[PDB]
Design a protein around this ligand. Structure first.
Ligand SMILES: CCCCCCCCCCCCCCCCCC(=O)OC[C@H](CO[C@@H]1O[C@H](CO[C@H]2O[C@H](CO)[C@H](O)[C@H](O)[C@H]2O)[C@H](O)[C@H](O)[C@H]1O)OC(=O)CCCCCCCCCCCCCCCCC
Ligand code: CLA
Ligand code: CLA
Ligand code: CLA
Ligand code: CLA
Ligand code: CLA
Ligand code: CLA
Ligand SMILES: CC1=C(/C=C/C(C)=C/C=C/C(C)=C/C=C/C=C(C)/C=C/C=C(C)/C=C/C2=C(C)CCCC2(C)C)C(C)(C)CCC1
Ligand SMILES: CC1=C(/C=C/C(C)=C/C=C/C(C)=C/C=C/C=C(C)/C=C/C=C(C)/C=C/C2=C(C)CCCC2(C)C)C(C)(C)CCC1
Ligand SMILES: CC1=C(/C=C/C(C)=C/C=C/C(C)=C/C=C/C=C(C)/C=C/C=C(C)/C=C/C2=C(C)CCCC2(C)C)C(C)(C)CCC1
Ligand SMILES: CCCCCCCS[C@@H]1O[C@H](CO)[C@@H](O)[C@H](O)[C@H]1O
Ligand SMILES: CCCCCCCS[C@@H]1O[C@H](CO)[C@@H](O)[C@H](O)[C@H]1O
Ligand code: OEX
Ligand SMILES: [Ca+2]
Ligand SMILES: [Cl-]
Ligand SMILES: [Cl-]
Ligand SMILES: [Fe+2]
Lengths: 78, 451, 342, 29, 334, 33, 137
């Protein structure tokens, strides 16, 4: 009894569904594409399945230098 | 909408089925529809198992629990548990699936369309929970039905092709039981066996003659008792001992199913006669023994004298004594020396494992079975990675014995809880205080102080 | 209704679906960012560069194995600010260096401050005593001791817990093998307050539900109560008699009962927090000296205490090379402690 | 001396249980 | 009335300081026997060959333990699930070496605690109470059955039952983690939610009721004197408490119905602990925690470790070290 | 009834990213190494 | 890193001839090794006889040599002890013992090649983890 429209009124109204039958699927498709385009890997710097190791390297690219860690990751990525 | 809200029935939606206690027609609907659910799952599950089934792999590598039940009855299988014909499996699945439509039909009809109460309509089908005579009569009918079910198993074993016998001389095979055990000293002797190790109460049954014989007794006992209950009314001492109400009777049956659920759990875990290891995988005890046997065979092939080989502790690395002197496998499997199985028994003599037989008579088929059982031990993860908990992914395996024991322990436990719930509710309701304490008649206020 | 301060105060304190308050200005952004940083990291962010682990749904982990992991040991106790000297404003690199860890831990810390200020604020407006805020000091002591003090006493944030289901399981096992934390009497007091609290929760709920007055006709008894009713809904007198006779003692004072329900778990969590402050310094209850002196001189003397240190020794040697990759441990097979066969 | 101490504290607690039960402040309505 | 009738009247009397009852007729002697044997063994029992390898473990105070390390040690792995009462032994000295006290204690205790639960039903019936306090107690009781009876049954030996001691308990937990990965089992996770949530809601309820106590005392008196045993009127304002808590979260997240609130307080920890108990009772039959060891693999086939693999390494340390002289063959299969 | 309340904002700060994330995670179920 | 033609190129015979397996054959080999062999040989060890593993260097020193497709295919038809001295079909799965090891009954020549190919490729991916046992988990 704080004023706002009751949730049960909103989610059973035709107009809620007209707005949301477009916004909900649009958001979901945008999330889908953020991954399917590969963009998620690049924003966050997460390795793709082919990018954890070089072909013959077999030690992990562990960061070992506090202030030049950013440079280490850049060289590791080289 | 007769009795289909809280106001009129006294029961909230989440206790809605309690609205049925005195509506025998709709309650019969609920019961018949539910029997259709059971029969449905049995038929659909069997067809699913059959559709997935690769006959040359062990059943126990395939997540099967129903085909193993059918195979044990001697359908579909030959020597060693080799699958010779999947058609009996198909028949079992289809007949249950078809039958469930009939029960589902009756269930929906009674629940939704038929008379809500049966008492007006019929005095034979109507009932009052408080009518002790009608209660024992219906109980008698069901006892006769159950007795006939028990004799159907005897009929299979004796007249319709036999049962799978893991103990058959020369190797596991389907065998017709011609000499079932009738001696009450053997049959009822099992019931007085200790449930502790080396004894195992009824779980110890180790031959099909005792199994068949017990069902001869049980079929007769149930039929006789069922007749008895149709023709008698409870004695006075019975009348004074029990609560007589629908909820009370539900509670007694909940206790009994809980007990049976625990018994089944131990049966599938330990017994390899009515749960042949050919179909269900090795028992935990069996796989542990099979590992010791494996390495004894290996190392003796390498030249070890396994009788005289002292392990790190001073006990024999391969062979030691049980606390009563019998020769048994050593290492941790010392705990499992009560284990008995067809691949090991040929090596056991009157003093336990026989060293002469071990040195000279172990056959390649015993080496194979022991390797198979060691590597199919019933250990595995919830996502079905077979092996100890530290195992890497590769082997997709959880034993049918683990699935069946765990499920039934869970069910048996919650059935004990439902027993307490309903038994305690039935007592309170019969005495009139299940809805709370009367504020003007609070028993404790009329009692003397404790101090 | 005066100056802007008092107009802002009015609006902040409106009676709405989600109360805001002055505390809301700290709470909402901090709780939102802690939770969103957790969902963002577990969904998209690796731990390859800090731990050599995959840790996100993106890389293939499930709800049990995802985490936002701590930064590399070389980061020490860096605040690891986005604009700081390590990431220098590069968002991608900051994610790869474990910046989301300190982001979550620090927003989470300020958020808990805001939640507790919210408890005080709402209590003051509604006119109740602020015991809920007081009780919440136990969650605060636990969060601060385990997520801030513990790693501050150790070499780096690397050894804080990582924010994940399996990551936290790993943290428990590490504390067993390295700190023998089960032996610690401050942890034992925590366990007593948690299990004793769960005990009080269960037994008090069951007792009320089973000593209820019949206040309606329904066999479902929940409708037979009214919030504004003057009367107790259940019989303290009958409840007291029942427990006095079953267990020997019983509550008779409802006020004491409810205070004790605050006291037990709040006190147990505060005790566990003190033990963790000691573990920040490796100041463990690891050993009983008299046990070791005896066992060293007497190879036939064995207790469950000596059995558990053998397990700890296994945990340390087997887990350390992959759990502490900055150490570059190489332990040849021949040096690993193992019993026979296994 | 340690065994004596542990058993003594334990015995005090069992005595305490006896008094707390049989010599409690009686509950009064 | 006759002797029997008076006896029955006394056994079932609502007037005894401690209720006796029919469950109590079994509970009293069984709990007494378990208690006396436990106390004597914990002080004075000699070392016990728990793992059947002639390597006796000292549990008692007089043989070099303190309160934290002491235990009554489980019975010998050579016994397995065999019933080992005193009269099965050639002497008390043999019975002690083989961990006889453990069996005597746990069987009498389980019987007695089961009767404790029946007695709770029994008295509630004598008092005209609703009957389900005994159902709340089934949760801790089921958990004691899991660790002292069901687990040994599954694994084939009481030597794998939980020891009766503080350090023995931790030993049982650590070995259980090695062998079942319990932490990764959802039933143990539900138990954690049950006990952490039970503690949380305990503190919540204590604090909400305490916060809304009606002023009945002065500042120099404990507020507890504001309540009198057996008074009719509720001692706090639930509407005030709900008004606070509905605002802390949002209105519909708070109970204003005391009956619903107290039912939730019962149910949450009781259901969680039932799942804890069923976790142990089903890992008894080796249906174990989720195994994601090497679940994540890169494009070439390199294993990319996750936190699950690091758990695995800790589990391996427990596994290889536990019972270091008891395994001769490469798999630990119980 | 007003449309755009504190509550409305609260709901969308959570609901909006939730749906976007759920689409991202659904897409992940089809990634092969 | 990738599963390349090069990683997939293994010894065909004892004379140094190689064969490059397809990715489909690699998948098939893992699948069939799981189907018929992993219950004892998970991760390249041997559960019922830990002294003998599936490492390539171990296979090379077997008699006849088993570190190539031909020696492995022949092993699956007629397995021997490590010195070549006894035929062990009666206790080890093989085509000649498909009667008693029924999972061998519908393995084709093509399937044996894929399994042999798995055994050689896997240590090229996993290194010492293949045949290493729990130490390398
Ligand atoms: C009315 C209530 C009655 C109350 C009265 C209480 C007094 C009675 C005591 C009952 C409790 C017994 C405990 C020991 C149970 C056990 O070790 O049971 C195991 C036995 C099976 O024993 C095993 O049986 C085996 C049978 O297999 C043998 O024979 C087979 C034949 O194929 C195979 O060859 C096999 O290899 C071979 O070993 C062997 O003898 C084993 O050595 C032996 O250990 O099960 C069985 O007897 C049947 C199973 C009994 C059920 C156990 C469930 C526990 C219930 C507690 C639930 C929780 C309570 C919750 C409260 C909240
Ligand atoms: C095995 C599960 C089961 C069964 C067999 C029943 C049976 C029944 N319940 Mg219970 N119930 C259940 C589970 C079940 N319930 C659960 C899980 C809950 C909690 C959600 C409830 C809560 C509940 C309440 C609150 C009430 C009942 C009531 C009833 C009865 C009247 C139903 C009615 O009025 O339908 C009206 C519904 C319809 C007309 C919709 C269609 C229903 C049919 C049966 C669907 C059948 C579908 C099936 C695929 C058809 C196959 C046909 C084919 C073979 C030809 C009926 C006997 C009522 C009662 O007791 O009346 C006296 C009542 O008030 N139930
Ligand atoms: C006795 C019951 C039982 C048992 C022992 C099994 C056993 C098995 N099933 Mg079958 N099955 C069952 C009933 C059972 N099922 C039912 C009711 C269905 C219909 C849904 C199926 C449908 C089915 C399919 C479609 C498949 C199986 C398969 C399997 C195998 C793998 C199972 C798995 O991976 O679990 C995974 C484990 C879980 C999903 C966890 C379940 C845990 C529940 C939710 C907890 C229960 C708690 C309690 C009951 C709730 C009470 C609440 C409390 C407050 C009172 C295994 C042999 C698979 C197979 O290999 O077939 C060849 C397979 O594909 N089953
Ligand atoms: C245990 C289950 C059960 C019980 C106690 C009842 C009882 C009743 N039924 Mg319901 N019903 C059931 C199941 C049941 N039915 C099933 C499965 C179906 C779907 C086929 C129906 C469909 C149904 C309809 C459509 C009607 C009834 C009616 C009736 C009433 C009269 C029956 C009669 O006059 O006998 C007559 C009996 C015979 C002529 C002999 C029956 C021969 C049987 C089939 C052979 C028995 C073999 C064996 C024991 C069966 C084993 C089954 C098991 C394996 C599952 C009575 C209240 C009527 C009613 O409600 O009137 C208003 C009504 O119209 N039933
Ligand atoms: C589902 C099956 C079932 C059910 C629910 C009933 C129910 C009933 N029976 Mg019937 N009965 C049945 C099957 C059944 N019976 C069969 C198959 C037969 C033929 C053998 C009988 C022969 C029979 C007779 C001769 C009598 C009853 C009587 C009764 C009534 C009271 C029973 C009682 O007090 O038991 C409780 C049991 C006792 C009080 C015995 C003492 C308690 C002991 C010590 C318990 C020990 C068990 C323990 C848990 C160990 C289990 C393992 C064990 C095998 C070693 C009640 C209506 C009585 C009656 O009123 O007739 C009208 C009566 O005199 N029944
Ligand atoms: C044959 C077995 C059986 C039968 C016929 C009943 C029947 C009944 N019970 Mg009992 N009960 C049982 C077993 C049974 N119960 C078990 C094993 C337990 C332990 C959990 C209970 C615990 C129980 C409680 C606590 C209550 C009842 C109640 C009732 C009544 C209402 C049921 C209802 O409407 O549920 C509606 C169904 C639901 C709301 C769905 C429940 C969903 C479950 C918990 C999750 C399953 C998850 C899945 C398996 C995975 C009804 C008389 C009520 C009462 O006492 O009435 C007198 C009540 O309050 N039962
Ligand atoms: C009440 C809300 C609140 C609080 C308490 C915090 C707190 C924090 N944030 Mg978070 N943040 C918030 C809201 C908040 N944030 C919002 C709404 C966003 C979205 C924009 C963010 C996004 C965010 C990011 C991306 C990061 C943080 C980081 C931080 C940490 C370092 C902050 C810092 O050093 O500021 C220093 C600034 C102040 C203390 C303001 C002081 C104002 C004084 C009193 C007046 C002086 C002003 C002066 C006149 C200006 C002259 C400057 C001139 C010389 C150029 C700290 C835990 C960092 C972190 O977590 O690293 C791990 C980090 O990287 N925040
Ligand atoms: C009452 C009620 C209820 C319940 C109900 C029920 C429980 C019912 C049942 C039902 C049932 C129980 C049904 C069944 C059905 C069945 C069917 C319908 C079948 C069919 C089949 C077929 C068609 C087959 C086919 C085939 C063949 C022949 C061969 C192979 C292949 C195939 C499979 C395809 C509820 C809960 C809702 C609630 C409300 C009330
Ligand atoms: C088939 C078979 C067999 C056989 C079997 C048999 C023969 C059985 C029988 C069984 C029986 C014959 C059982 C019985 C049971 C009983 C019971 C289970 C009882 C119960 C009781 C009760 C429950 C009671 C109660 C009470 C009391 C106690 C007190 C008072 C009150 C009252 C009444 C409540 C064998 C093993 C050979 C083999 C395999 C198969
Ligand atoms: C970090 C960061 C940030 C922030 C961010 C954020 C704020 C985010 C948010 C985010 C979010 C906000 C997200 C969300 C997500 C969600 C999700 C992902 C969900 C899921 C769910 C599910 C899956 C469900 C499940 C379940 C349950 C829970 C129970 C019941 C049943 C079921 C199973 C259904 C910024 C920009 C400042 C910058 C720096 C960094
Ligand atoms: C419920 C109806 C099921 C029909 C029963 C089918 C009989 S079963 C059938 O019986 C033969 C002997 O006549 C056996 O030799 C054969 O192996 C067996 O499968
Ligand atoms: C957010 C912290 C703000 C601290 C308050 C600063 C006092 S500001 C204060 O506000 C008055 C309103 O009565 C004005 O009339 C007055 O001019 C001004 O001094
Ligand atoms: O005992 Mn006690 O612990 Ca159950 O695993 Mn096997 O056994 Mn022994 O090893 Mn691991
Ligand atoms: Ca590729
Ligand atoms: Cl140990
Ligand atoms: Cl062993
Ligand atoms: Fe309360």
């Amino acid at each position: 009894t704080t004023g706002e429209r009751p949730f049960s009124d909103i989610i059973t109204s035709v107009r809620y569904w007209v707005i949301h039958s477009i916004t909900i699927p649009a958001l979901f498709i945008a999330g889908w594409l953020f991954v399917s385009t590969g963009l998620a890997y690049d924003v966050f710097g997460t390795p793709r399945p082919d990018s954890y190791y070089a072909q013959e390297q077999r030690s992990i690219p562990l960061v070992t230098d506090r202030f030049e860690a950013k440079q280490q990751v850049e060289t590791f990525l080289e | 909408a007769t009795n289909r809200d809280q106001e009129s029935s006294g029961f909230a939606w989440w206790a809605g089925n309690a609205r049925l206690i005195n509506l025998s027609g709709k309650l019969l609907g609920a019961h018949v529809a539910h029997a259709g659910l059971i029969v449905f799952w049995a038929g659909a599950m069997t067809l699913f198992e059959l559709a997935h089934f690769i006959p040359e792999k062990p059943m126990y590598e395939q997540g099967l629990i129903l085909i193993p039940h059918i195979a044990t009855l001697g359908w579909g299988v030959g020597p060693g548990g080799e699958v010779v014909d999947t058609f009996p499996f198909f028949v079992v699945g289809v007949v249950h699936l078809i039958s469930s439509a009939v029960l589902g039909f009756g269930g929906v009809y009674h629940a939704i369309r038929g008379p809500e109460t049966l008492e007006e309509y019929s005095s034979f089908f109507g009932y009052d929970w408080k009518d002790k005579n009608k209660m024992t009569t219906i109980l008698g009918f069901h006892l006769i039905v159950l007795g006939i079910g028990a004799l159907l198993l005897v009929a299979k074993a004796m007249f319709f092709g036999g049962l799978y016998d893991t103990w058959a001389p020369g190797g596991g095979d389907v065998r017709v039981i011609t000499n079932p055990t009738l001696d009450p000293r053997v049959i009822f002797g099992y019931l007085l066996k200790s449930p502790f190790g080396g004894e195992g109460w009824i779980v110890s049954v180790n031959n099909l003659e005792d199994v068949v014989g017990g069902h001869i007794w049980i079929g007769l006992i149930c039929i006789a008792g069922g007749i008895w209950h149709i023709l008698t009314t409870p004695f006075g001492w019975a009348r004074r001992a029990f609560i007589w109400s629908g909820e009370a009777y539900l509670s007694y049956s909940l206790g009994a199913l809980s007990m049976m659920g625990f018994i089944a759990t131990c049966f599938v875990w330990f017994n390899n006669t009515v749960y042949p290891s050919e179909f269900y995988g090795p028992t935990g005890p069996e796989a542990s023994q099979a590992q010791a046997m494996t390495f004894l065979i290996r190392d003796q092939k390498l030249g070890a004298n396994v009788g005289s080989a002292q392990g790190p502790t001073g006990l024999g690395k391969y062979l030691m004594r049980s606390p009563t002197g019998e020769i048994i496998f050593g290492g941790e499997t010392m705990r499992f020396w009560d284990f008995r199985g067809p691949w090991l028994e040929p090596l056991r003599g009157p003093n336990g494992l026989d060293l002469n037989k071990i040195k000279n008579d172990i056959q390649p088929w015993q080496e194979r079975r022991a390797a198979e059982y060691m590597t199919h031990a019933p250990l595995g993860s919830l996502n079905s990675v077979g092996g100890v908990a530290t195992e890497i992914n590769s082997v997709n395996f959880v034993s049918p014995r683990s699935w069946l024991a765990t499920s039934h322990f869970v069910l048996a436990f919650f059935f004990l809880v439902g027993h307490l719930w309903h038994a305690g509710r039935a007592r309170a309701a019969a005495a009139g205080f299940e809805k709370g304490i009367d504020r003007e008649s609070e028993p404790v206020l009329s009692m003397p102080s404790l101090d | 209704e005066r100056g802007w301060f008092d107009i802002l105060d009015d609006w902040l304190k409106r009676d709405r679906f989600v109360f805001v308050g002055w505390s809301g200005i700290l709470l909402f952004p901090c709780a939102y960012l802690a939770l969103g940083g957790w969902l963002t990291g577990t969904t998209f962010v690796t731990s390859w560069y800090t731990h050599g682990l995959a840790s996100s749904y993106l890389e293939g982990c499930n709800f049990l194995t995802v985490a936002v992991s701590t930064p590399a040991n070389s980061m020490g106790h860096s605040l690891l600010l986005l604009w700081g000297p390590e990431a220098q404003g590069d968002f991608t690199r900051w994610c790869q260096l474990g910046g989301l860890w300190t982001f979550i831990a620090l927003h989470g810390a300020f958020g808990l401050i805001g939640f507790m200020l919210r408890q005080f604020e709402i209590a003051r407006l509604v006119g109740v005593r602020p015991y809920n805020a007081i009780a919440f000091s136990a969650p605060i002591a636990v969060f601060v001791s385990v997520f801030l003090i513990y790693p501050l006493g150790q070499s780096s944030w690397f050894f804080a817990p990582s924010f994940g289901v399996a990551a936290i399981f790993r943290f428990l096992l590490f504390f067993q093998g390295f700190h023998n934390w089960t032996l610690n009497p401050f942890h034992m007091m925590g366990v007593a307050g948690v299990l004793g609290g769960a005990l009080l929760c269960a037994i008090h709920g069951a007792t009320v539900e089973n000593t209820l007055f019949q206040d309606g006709e329904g066999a479902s008894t929940f409708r037979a109560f009214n919030p504004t009713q003057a009367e107790e809904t259940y019989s303290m007198v009958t409840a007291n008699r029942f427990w006095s006779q079953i267990f020997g003692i019983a509550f008779s004072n409802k006020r004491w009962l409810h205070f004790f329900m605050l006291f037990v778990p709040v006190t147990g969590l505060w005790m566990s927090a003190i033990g963790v402050v000691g573990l920040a310094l490796n100041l463990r209850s690891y050993d009983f000296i008299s046990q070791e002196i005896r066992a060293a001189e007497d190879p036939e003397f064995e207790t469950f205490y000596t059995k558990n240190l053998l397990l700890n020794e296994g945990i340390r040697a087997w887990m350390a090379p992959q759990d502490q990759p900055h150490e570059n441990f190489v332990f040849p097979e021949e040096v690993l402690p193992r019993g026979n066969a296994l | 001396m340690e065994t004596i101490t542990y058993v003594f504290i334990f015995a005090c607690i069992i005595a305490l249980f006896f008094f707390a039960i049989f010599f409690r402040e009686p509950p009064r309505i | 009335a006759n002797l029997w009738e008076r006896f029955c009247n006394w056994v079932t009397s609502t007037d005894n300081r401690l209720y006796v009852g029919w469950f109590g007729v079994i509970m009293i002697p069984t709990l007494l026997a378990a208690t006396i044997c436990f106390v004597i063994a914990f002080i004075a029992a000699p070392p016990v060959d728990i793992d059947g390898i002639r390597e006796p473990v000292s549990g008692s105070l007089l043989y070099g333990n303190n309160i934290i390390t002491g235990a009554v040690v489980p019975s010998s792995n050579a016994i397995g699930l065999h019933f080992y009462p005193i009269w099965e032994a050639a002497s008390l000295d043999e019975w002690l070496y083989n961990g006889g006290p453990y069996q005597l204690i746990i069987f009498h205790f389980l019987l007695g605690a089961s009767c404790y639960m029946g007695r709770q039903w029994e008295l509630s019936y004598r008092l005209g109470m609703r009957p389900w306090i005994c159902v709340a107690y089934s949760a801790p009781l089921a958990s004691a059955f899991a660790v002292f009876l069901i687990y040994p049954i599954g694994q084939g030996s009481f030597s794998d039952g939980m020891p009766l001691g503080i350090s023995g308990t931790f030993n049982f937990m650590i070995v259980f983690q090695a062998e079942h990965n319990i932490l990764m089992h959802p039933f143990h996770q539900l138990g954690v939610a049950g006990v952490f949530g039970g503690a949380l809601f305990c503190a919540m309820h204590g604090s909400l009721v305490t916060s809304s106590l009606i002023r009945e005392t002065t500042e120099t008196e404990s507020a507890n004197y504001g309540y009198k045993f057996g008074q009719e009127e509720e001692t706090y304002n639930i509407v005030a408490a709900h008004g606070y808590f509905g605002r802390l979260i949002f209105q519909y997240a708070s109970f204003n119905n005391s009956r619903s609130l107290h039912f939730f307080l019962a149910a949450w920890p009781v259901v969680g602990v039932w799942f804890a108990a069923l976790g142990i009772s089903t890992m008894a039959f080796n249906l174990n925690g989720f195994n994601f060891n090497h679940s994540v693999i890169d494009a070439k086939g390199n294993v990319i470790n996750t936190w699950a693999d690091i758990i695995n390494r800790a589990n391996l340390g427990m596994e290889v070290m536990h019972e270091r002289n008891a395994h001769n063959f490469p798999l630990d299969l119980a | 009834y007003p449309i755009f309340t504190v509550r409305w904002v609260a709901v969308h700060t959570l609901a909006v990213p939730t749906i976007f994330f759920l689409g991202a995670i659904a897409a992940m179920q089809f990634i092969q190494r | 890193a990738e599963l390349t033609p090069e990683v997939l190129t293994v010894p065909l015979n004892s004379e140094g001839k190689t064969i490059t397996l397809t990715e489909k054959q690699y998948l098939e080999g893992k699948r069939l090794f799981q189907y018929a062999c992993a219950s004892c040989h998970v991760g390249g060890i041997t559960k019922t006889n830990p002294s003998l593993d599936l490492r390539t260097e171990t296979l090379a020193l077997a008699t006849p040599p088993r570190d190539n497709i031909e020696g492995l295919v022949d092993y699956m038809k007629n397995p021997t002890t490590y010195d070549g001295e006894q035929e062990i079909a009666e206790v080890h799965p093989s085509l000649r013992s498909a009667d008693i090891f029924p999972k061998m009954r519908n393995l084709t020549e093509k399937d044996l090649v894929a399994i042999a190919g798995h055994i050689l490729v896997e240590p090229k991916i996993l290194g010492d983890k293949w045949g290493g046992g729990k130490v390398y988990y």
